[PDB]
Amino acid sequence: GELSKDGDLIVSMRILGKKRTKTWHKGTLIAIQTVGPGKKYKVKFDNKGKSLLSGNHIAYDYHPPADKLYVGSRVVAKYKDGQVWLYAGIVAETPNVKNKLRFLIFFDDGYASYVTQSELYPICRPLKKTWEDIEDISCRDFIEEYVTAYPNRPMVLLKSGQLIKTEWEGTWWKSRVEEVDGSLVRILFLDDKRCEWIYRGSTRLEPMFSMKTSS
Template sequence: MEQVEMDMGLSDIRGSLEVVKMKRERKSSGGKYADDKTLSKKRQWEDDSDSLGVVKKALVVLTRLPDYKISALRPPTPLQFYSEDESLSTSESDSNLEPGNKSSGSDLSKLKNKRNTEICSKCSTRRTAVQNNNKIEPAPIIISTAFALCADETRNVRPDLPEQEVAVDMMVLARKKHMRWQRGKILEILTREDGRLKYKVSFEEKGKSLVSGHHIAYDNTPKLEQLYVGARVVVSCSENKFHFQTGILAELPSRKNRLRFLVFTDDHVPLYVGLPSLHLVCRPLENSLEDLPDSPHKSFMTRYLRDWPYPHLTQYKAGQNINVEFNGVQQRCEVKLVDSSLIQVVFQDDQQKEWIHRGSTRLEHMIRILKLRELEEEKNDSD
């Protein structure tokens, strides 16, 4: 019995000594055992993550967007004013499909075919197609967009600048006959009973005339800040450089017209000219259009200045056949050149060439759209 108790006591002592020995070894090793355990756990975690990486591999799936989403992502286009064409969209267009509508491919093709059929039938009744050499020519689009962005390029109000002096012995351009001005010298300035001034001019090419202030123009070149759309100007005649014609300034220089001035002479002829070709009328009427005789040209200029800087222009391409009024009759022409707001046409009958403004009422398409606008305005007024 005593021997057994002694053996148990010795075993306890040995166990205590082993525990003390382990603690000393752990302390002397600086926690190496704990570090080994941590490293083993880290390796195990890396092995697990490597195994998971094989399973969770990233995939890229390309899906074609439906047409309604593609239409929504497109940037908006500027508003256009159409003459014979309408917007190519109908109430049943596939761009109006709801996102949740799961239409099959066959349904979409049927819907598109139906839309194309409706568009074709509408175009056949609303647009003119002329067959020439087995070629069908669509009617042009009438657009109405801002002519320019800079205020100096769209100025249509007379600048508030001091008037230049008009004195005796001053060289001017004066009206000798209708649509014919010449260079001359002011001999005398007369004051009428009603207070109006009259200028007696002696022309270089013989003759004298007594004219009003809006029938004389400065002989010198004007400054750019003096000019504006709607200004009454005089330009040299193309047939004779010593003769001049009056007109209305219709465009100021911009990148769209390659830094030129557009002038409509009083006989509805459009001209692109440079600054040295312009001469300002000395004392223009408050409304320059009052100096024009009643005619289709006056109606055109009234509408043009009212719509500025959003004039209506037809869009043509070189080689296109169109109808243009000449001597009161619509005649067949071919577009030869397009120069900014002008087109050069060649009449088929006599091969005569002429420059015409793309918004002129001599164009058959422009006449049609103006009639449609008048009908719409009358309808709106009645409503």
């Protein structure tokens, strides 16, 4: 059952597709096929290769009008190191003055970043519960809890210069708050002076852990 269109998806459109590296790449939608319970989308990548993909593994090659995205929306966004890569995630906050009109993204591996309105792309056919295709179960479970509770977001008030313990990979590290940016805090780990931007409601921050573990 070949199709030339699926709603707004049309054969020949520009698209992003997910590769097995989990990075996303520009290409062209070359076929739509009904296969079992749904549709498959064949993508020819600009650089190298052809993939047959599910609808949650393609994204539009345009930056959406900001108001079409919501907390919980499934997106691909720019993830910088240094490169620039496109990686999937979930919108955690929409643009407001307090965040300098940026989107907060929680990526599928648990990385967090603010991105601009021109640095994200909507996934075409996400799952209704958008987090159900997140492979990392700890990130999946976190996003379900976060989106379900939203707009209830307990956070710690931190100030530049404040010393706290911050968790990383099973150890609690002496650290310092360097900067606050909206719902993120830039933490300097004192043992090596590398930083990490962490959500101010994350229980990786000792004050937030302390509050959530009290009862």
